[PDB]
Amino acid sequence: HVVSYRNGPPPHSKATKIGALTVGGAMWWWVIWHLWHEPDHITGEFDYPNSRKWSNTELG
Amino acid sequence: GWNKDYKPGPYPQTEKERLAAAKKYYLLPEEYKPYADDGLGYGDYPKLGYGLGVEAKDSYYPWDYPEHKRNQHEPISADHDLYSEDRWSQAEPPRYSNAYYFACFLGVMSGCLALYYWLDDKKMYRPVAAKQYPSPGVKHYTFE
Amino acid sequence: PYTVPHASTYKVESVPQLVEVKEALGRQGLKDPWLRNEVWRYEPKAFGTHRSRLNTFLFRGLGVGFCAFLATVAVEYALGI
Amino acid sequence: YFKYNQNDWTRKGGWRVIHSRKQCVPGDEGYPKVSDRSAPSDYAARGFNESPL
Amino acid sequence: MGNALTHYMKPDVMPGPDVVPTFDPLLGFKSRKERVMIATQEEMESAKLPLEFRDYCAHLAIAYQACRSDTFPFVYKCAHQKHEYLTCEYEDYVLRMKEFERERRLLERQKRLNKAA
Amino acid sequence: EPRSPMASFAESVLNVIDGPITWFRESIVEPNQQKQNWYHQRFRRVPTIDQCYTDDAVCRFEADQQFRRDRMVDNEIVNILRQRFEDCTLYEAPDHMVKCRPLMDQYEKATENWFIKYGDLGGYANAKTAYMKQKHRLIWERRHGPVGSGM
Amino acid sequence: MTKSAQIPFSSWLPAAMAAPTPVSALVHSSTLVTAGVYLLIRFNIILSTSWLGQLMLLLSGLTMFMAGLGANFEFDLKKIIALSTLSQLGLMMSILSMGFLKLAMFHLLTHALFKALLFMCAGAIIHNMNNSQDIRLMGGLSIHMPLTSACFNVSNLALCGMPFLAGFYSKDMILEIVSISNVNMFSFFLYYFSTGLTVSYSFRLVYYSMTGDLNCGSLNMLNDESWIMLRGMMGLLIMSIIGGSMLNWLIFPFPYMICLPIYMKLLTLFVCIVGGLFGYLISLSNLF
Amino acid sequence: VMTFLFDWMSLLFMSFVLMISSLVIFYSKEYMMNDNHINRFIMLVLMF
Amino acid sequence: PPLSLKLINERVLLVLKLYDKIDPSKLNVESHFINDLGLDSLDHVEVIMAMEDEFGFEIPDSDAEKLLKPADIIKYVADKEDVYE
Amino acid sequence: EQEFIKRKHEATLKLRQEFLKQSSNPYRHATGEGGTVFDAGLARFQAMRVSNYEHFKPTGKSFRTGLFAVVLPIALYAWALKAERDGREEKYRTGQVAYKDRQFKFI
Amino acid sequence: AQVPLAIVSHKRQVCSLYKRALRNLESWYDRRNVYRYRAVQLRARFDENRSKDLGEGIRLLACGQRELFETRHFQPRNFANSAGGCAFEREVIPPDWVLDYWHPLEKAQYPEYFAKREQRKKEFVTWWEKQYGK
Ligand SMILES: CCCCCCCCCCCCCCCCCC(=O)OC[C@H](COP(=O)(O)OCCN)OC(=O)CCCCCCCCCCCCCCCCC
């Protein structure tokens, strides 16, 4: 339980900075990998038909 | 000391008996205030507490008993259960009256019930005709 | 409390927020006595600024994440095109 | 206990295991399959059909 | 706002939520094909399909269950043909939308049937 | 048979579980066990409370005991029929609305007949009380028609 | 309803912040708040046909609106996360009333994972700070806790609905299946607003506790040398990263088909950006 | 009846709650090492 | 944490020298807050509240009347922090 | 009123010194027999809770409290139970319900 | 060895109103610069009324207490380690004589500590005899 007065934290170890870069790299790698490989969930899996310019001869 | 020796006596009806009753309860004569003998009153017992709580008492005073916030021979309040730190006691006084909180809550609930059950018969729906299932004998056709 | 600072290392004019609230109080015609007490916070060297903390919070390790993404692009092309 | 000391029909108070029907995908043995024990007496037998009585 | 708001405004024009067709089919008298099913009820019950997911293409879901049980728990290898099953559902959804749109036009025809007399 | 690696792993874990227990049964438990015979206990038919006299108490005990035993026998009749319906519900997991309707019909008929014989008697149900209930019920269906129609 | 703290029996969770933080994590994240949903997942057959479905669809949506507006106006970290549990429970119970028990369970498992990490974080913050947990005290923890702040970032964006996380894989499937099925207009208004409300109080908690001026007091301790907490933090961190990813592929033998228009499909992402900017830029305080 | 149910939903949620509780307890040792009777808290969490 | 009397003395004198209504000179632990310095009745509330936001505990009103110099301020802080060395 | 506060303060100081003498006693602790320091207020509270009946008189306020507190809910609850069971008994004995459509068959 | 006295002065009431008003003011305004600006504004509002006499000061004190009751925050900021906070009395320390009721085999784990305790029992009974008498 280290304590510093009227100042910020003590300078952190190599392990915490390496771990923070690991967490950020893993999260953003998963996010960017899923925006590349499966971009279909955001826009929509199928294109929505307009149901306005359909011909009356096809539908009767 | 037993229950027959230390016991609330009769209602005083005398200034001298009131002074002796105040001296009996370690209560200053101005402080003592007996219950009115209305059939449910307490004869020869002080009326103490009865604020908005025992939690209203300051915790920074050096009490002899900090778990009840009382002195040594200070007599117990008559409804000490109901006004205790468990039930119905607050540190600060409440901001509004008691009817305001219930009135605002029931007004909000009445408005939300009226708005929800007025819109119960008109529900949002996508342009979809009907879900299609193969019961025997549909003879149902496509658009091809 | 192991390393207490001196009273001369805290100056009001270093922090711009204390400068602007002192200028606003001078426009009002009043002065604040306790304004030198909050010099150790809003310090740009040990503590961060508002813009740098948000950038190191939301976008943290995004270059590492983009490098791992490019590594998976590089190794996934050899396995399945 | 759950293999050889099940709740038999002769007693009350065992751990009476009732199991559901397993699914059958294509590639399994006998894919066109109707559910067995469709007679009413076959449900909840608890070993009564193999009783010597 | 929304289509239900128009259901509060034009009940004779807008059909409403989950509508039965209320019309004799082949009104246009075109070659409407009959919707048939490859699978039967016996292997539908053998595959333990629920009552909600018994659509006109439940055999694509049956093949998806076959690919799930073929490679389990690693079920990310059937994904493309999984998408194939979803496309069949999408086609069914399109047909539902088609029927609803046809419904609106027919009620519009009923509107000029109210202008017929 | 190992279609998926998960099913092959489950078969392997089930074989590792299955092996020592059947070895301990067939090698240790099944030898050195003597072959004794136990029988399901069978009862005669004591005369019913109809033939019992008013002052007789030796035969009201036998009639009350066979009434209690018949109440018990009908209790696991209804209980077994309920477990048959529940096993129908579990075994026909997506199609219990078709297969279990006749089993539910037999269960409802059994509950109706059980309440007609034993219902509203209370905690202290003697053989006299059910017989008085049956006499009053048959009088009501003779005069006023069946119960639930009216009158 | 009384177990899962809905209208009006919802007052026992700010009471439940008086518990120690690991058991508050267990109670709110999983266990007691979750159990009421599980019994209604069992009784969904009755609820989807009765008037109890309409009553719960009103009441859990009101719990959503009350919980999100509460967590926007509260100044207590543990009470804000309790209100976040209430908002997620209201979203789950409302989905349960209109069938969709599998979608409710899918959001339940991911919510239990991410909520526990946030409670484990919040407790790590409170230990290092003097017990006091008023969010006006801690201000600048994004530098001072480079791993606890990162874990709070990941699980907070999972609660938000950042795309392709465990929260998003069930929140998007909840919010689009309601948009393709029949819904009351009041319940459709209460949904998107609550999802907007959630990124509003999540990014407000971002600006108070982190990325700002440290306001705690003259003497404080701040360190990241503890690691017995942080190993379990990494365990639930990897689980919160790939948890909805492993679960979406195996909870669904039949994937739900989405054929919404582009504006209703992007409505949840649009209200996420609107609530994220509105829950942050309003929270900025300047002079006058 | 004393009854147990083994379906996929109950088994999955039971596994998730056990994993959550194990990681919260491994958190709770470092969180509550300043406490007096940690054994009381851990056995009570186990009965919970 | 770990405290000593010299750290409390340094903290109290540091935050008192940061106060602008008092001059940094002519400040001592035995100096009275009322008549020896220029602070009025209301500035003592600001000094007591500065003690509260530094040392992390709030001080009652009668204890604020009891404290009149930095010496019993140090004694009052050392009583609750229980250093006594 | 200031002298009343001073007299109350002097009495409180005397009781505080009595409490500090008696609660922290070596010789009372050293006997090993547990107990409580002699508190008058707890004994008066206990005997007020036990021996309260001797200050109870028949008064219209006490009669109204005993009427609308205990006897009146008993009367309306017994009337509601009797009315519901009489209506259900008339329905059950007239013959308006069947043996298969009857609630609470205990089966 | 003094206890606080139950009387209150007008100076005490104005000081308590000023402290409670600044506590409510810092509970309303989170940032320190805005709190300092509003604290100087409240200082000017309390410094403008110093020149008034006793009756108008009492009336202004009552009006200020009433208005502070009107504008009081629903969650005021309080220190958790002090009274009224969440972390107040997190653990209850029993009195030390339960250490007197340990087993002798359980007392054998700290023999130097229990011998020191016996020495302080002799010192305490000497102190109690010279302080409170026999
Ligand atoms: C990739 C994605 C998927 C995976 C990730 C997501 C899911 C999992 C989530 C968690 C992820 C990992 C999180 C890791 C956190 C740290 C765990 C760990 O290894 O901690 C070290 C542990 C304790 O170390 P220490 O602090 O020294 O404790 C005292 C001695 N135990 O020390 C040890 O563990 C070492 C000693 C172990 C001794 C016991 C080993 C097992 C023995 C058999 C036990 C059988 C129990 C049977 C009874 C119960 C079951 C019926």
Please write down the HEC assignment for all residues of G188-231: HHHHHHHHHHHHHHHHHHHHHHCCCCCCCCCEECCCCCCCHHHH
Name beta bridge partners: F53.
Answer: none
Closest CA to G120 of G10, G35, G31, G20: G20
Residue reference for tokens 């009384």 = G2
End-to-end CA distance of chain A: 79
| CA pair distance G62, F42, nearest whole angstrom | 65
Ramachandran category for residue F148: left, alpha or beta (phi over 0 → left; psi -120 to 50 → alpha) = left
Q: Which amino acid is located at A11 in the chain?
A: P
| CA pair distance G258, G173, nearest whole angstrom | 9
β-pairing, G219-220 vs A4-5, is antiparallel
Q: Which two tokens stand for residue K32?
A: 């320190």
Query: Residue whose CA is closest, atom 17 of ligand 1?
Result: G231
What phi, psi does B141 have (nearest 5°)?
A: -115, 155
**C19 SS3 class:** helix
| CA pair distance G187, G57, nearest whole angstrom | 7
Q: Which amino acid is located at E90 in the chain?
A: Y
Residue reference for tokens 């029949």 = G182
| CA pair distance H34, H41, nearest whole angstrom | 13
DSSP assignments along chain B, one per residue? --TTTS-------SHHHHHHHHHHTT--TTT--BPP-SSS--TT-B----SS-STTS-TTS--SBTTTTB-SSPPPPTTTTTTSSSSS--SSPPSS-HHHHHHHHHHHHHHHHHHHHHSSSSEE--S--------TT---B---
Identify the closest residue of chain B to K73 by CA–CA distance: B95
The residue of E72, E75, E76, E78 whose CB has the most chain F CBs within 10 angstroms, and thus the best one to mutate to test that interface, is E72
Q: Say which residues have a Cβ less than 8 Å from residue J72's Cβ, sequence separation at least 6.
A: none
Identify the closest residue of chain J to B27 by CA–CA distance: J8
| CA pair distance G19, K104, nearest whole angstrom | 37
| CA pair distance D27, B28, nearest whole angstrom | 96
Closest CA to G174 of G241, G111, G92, G252: G92
Contact predicate G102/E53, CB 8 Å: no
Mutual angle of helices A14-37 and G148-160, in 10-degree steps: 20
CA distances (Å), A11 to each of A8, G149, G224, J64, in order? 9, 16, 10, 75
Residue reference for tokens 């759950």 = D2
What phi, psi does E34 have (nearest 5°)?
A: -90, 130
β-pairing, G183-184 vs G219-220, is unpaired
Contact G206 C57 (CB under 8 A): yes
Q: Say which residues have a Cβ less than 8 Å from residue F126's Cβ, sequence separation at least 6.
A: F49, F60, F64, F67
Catalytic status, residue I82: no
| CA pair distance G207, G72, nearest whole angstrom | 12
Ligand 1 site-directed mutation target among G226, G231, G236, most atoms within 8 Å of CB = G231
| CA pair distance G167, E44, nearest whole angstrom | 34
**G184 SS3 class:** strand
Q: Say which residues have a Cβ less than 8 Å from residue F129's Cβ, sequence separation at least 6.
A: F121, F122
Q: Which two tokens stand for residue G197?
A: 């409300």
Mutual angle of helices A14-37 and C62-79, in 10-degree steps: 50
Q: How far from chain centre, in Å, is Cα H14?
A: 10
Q: Decide: G246 in ligand 1 pocket, CB within 6 A.
A: no
Residues of F in contact with E74 (CB under 8 A): 5
| CA pair distance G29, I25, nearest whole angstrom | 57
End-to-end CA distance of chain F: 68
| CA pair distance G217, G203, nearest whole angstrom | 24
DSSP assignments along chain K, one per residue? -----S---HHHHHHHHHHHHHHHHHHH--SHHHHHHHHHHHHHHHHTTSSS-HHHHHHHHHHHHHHHHHS--SS----SSSTTSTTTT-S-PPPGGGGGGS-HHHHTTSHHHHHHHHHHHHHHHHHHHHHS--
Q: Within 10 A of B27 (CB to CB), how many other CB atoms are there?
A: 19
Identify the closest residue of chain E to F2 by CA–CA distance: E70
Task: Say which of I23, I40, I53, I63 is annotated catalytic.
Answer: I40
Q: Which two tokens stand for residue J35?
A: 């107990």
CA distances (Å), A25 to each of A31, G97, G149, in order? 10, 40, 15
| CA pair distance D36, D22, nearest whole angstrom | 12
- Give all chains having 3 or more CB-to-CB distances under 8 Å with chain K: B, C, G, I, J
| CA pair distance G65, B137, nearest whole angstrom | 48
| CA pair distance J56, G250, nearest whole angstrom | 73
Contact K19 I61 (CB under 8 A): yes
The residue of G134, G137, G218, G222 whose CB has the most chain I CBs within 10 angstroms, and thus the best one to mutate to test that interface, is G218
Closest CA to A1 of G153, I56, C2: C2
Mutual angle of helices G77-97 and G166-180, in 10-degree steps: 40
Q: Which two tokens stand for residue I81?
A: 């922090």
Q: Which two tokens stand for residue B13?
A: 């009806």
Breaks after residues in chain J, judged by C–N over 2.5 Å: none
Chain E positions with Cβ closer than 8 Å to G? 2, 4, 17-18, 53, 61, 64-65, 68, 73, 75-76, 82, 85-86, 89-90, 93-94
Q: For the stretch F112-132, what's the b/e string if a residue is b when 16 or more beta carbons lie within 10 angstroms of its beta carbon?
A: bbbbeebbeeeeebebebbbe
* 3-class SS string, chain E: CCHHHHHHHCCCCCCCCCCCCCCCCCCCCCCCCECCCCCCHHHHHHCCCCCCCCCCCCHHHHHHHHHHHHCCCCCCCCHHHHHHHHHHHHHHHHHHHHHHHHHHHHHHHHHHHHCCC
Contact predicate E13/B125, CB 8 Å: no
Resolution in angstrom units: 3.4
- Give all chains having 3 or more CB-to-CB distances under 8 Å with chain C: A, G, I, K
CA angle K130, K131, K133 (to 5 degrees): 70
Q: Decide: G287 in ligand 1 pocket, CB within 6 A.
A: no
Contact predicate H35/G22, CB 8 Å: no
3-state helix, strand, coil in chain J (%, to 5): 70, 0, 30
Q: Within 10 A of B102 (CB to CB), how many other CB atoms are there?
A: 10
CA torsion E37→E39→E45→E49, rounded to 10°? -70
